[PDB]
Amino acid sequence: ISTLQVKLYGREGSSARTIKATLPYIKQDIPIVIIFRALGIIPDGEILEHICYDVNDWQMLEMLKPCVEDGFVIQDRETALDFIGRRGKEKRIQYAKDILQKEFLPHITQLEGFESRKAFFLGYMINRLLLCALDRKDQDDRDHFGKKRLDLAGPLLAQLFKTLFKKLTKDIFRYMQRT
Amino acid sequence: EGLVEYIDAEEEESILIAMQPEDLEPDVDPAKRIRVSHHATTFTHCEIHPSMILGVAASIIPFPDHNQSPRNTYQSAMGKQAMGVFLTN
């Protein structure tokens, strides 16, 4: 159960309106351009293509300019993963390249043959965020019952039994290694 | 037979529900309650029955639509404290 947050720094009036993200047990927040370049999408525009699904929308792109200004330092994949790894010698890349598979958006895939999925999805989140920031769509209703779940006997007993059975198979592992 | 459908709130967002099946039809009683005529046409669903918005405890309340809501709440609370046959055995 991981929680990804995409933060928009700089309120209405500030000039440093950059967009960063929070990755699982990684020290500091990472600029979104660095994330996209770490996923394989290196040049600009293509990132904006992954974010802004309408080239006519000049406002959204205008809002995306300082993000490009932010991630202008990193211009390739290797140094992007190197950046994330520096946060968290080449081992760090393999650390980084792991976080983008096992920890960064696990609900789509935890495999290794999927990078465009998480990239497009991240771009979708950016799109929603900016749509909310441009006053085109208001804040999400956190009291909406449709976006809530009721765990009954099933799921509860499922969690509990997963715990107890994992403890059991662990104990059995111990009795096994005892022999 | 596609006569009834299961709808959660999320899908409920995208539909138009008729309150009563008499809202599909194209000098009055002053006693009866005032009901706004259907200004909506494109219905996709109709309520089975509005009284199904209530739970088990509030379904015991006689004429809850003639009460102040906190009284319905209070009655809903006190219904669980009434005596009587809880089980035959």
Partner: peptide, 30 residues
């Protein structure tokens, strides 16, 4: 006939079709 539209009283026939199959504690059992 049998193609006429429902009234408002025939609704409780459908509600009776419900519960007769589901019961009152359906979510628990399911």
């Amino acid at each position: 006939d049998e193609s006429a539209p429902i009234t408002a009283e025939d609704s409780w026939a459908v509600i009776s079709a419900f519960f007769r199959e589901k019961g009152l504690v359906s979510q628990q059992l399911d």
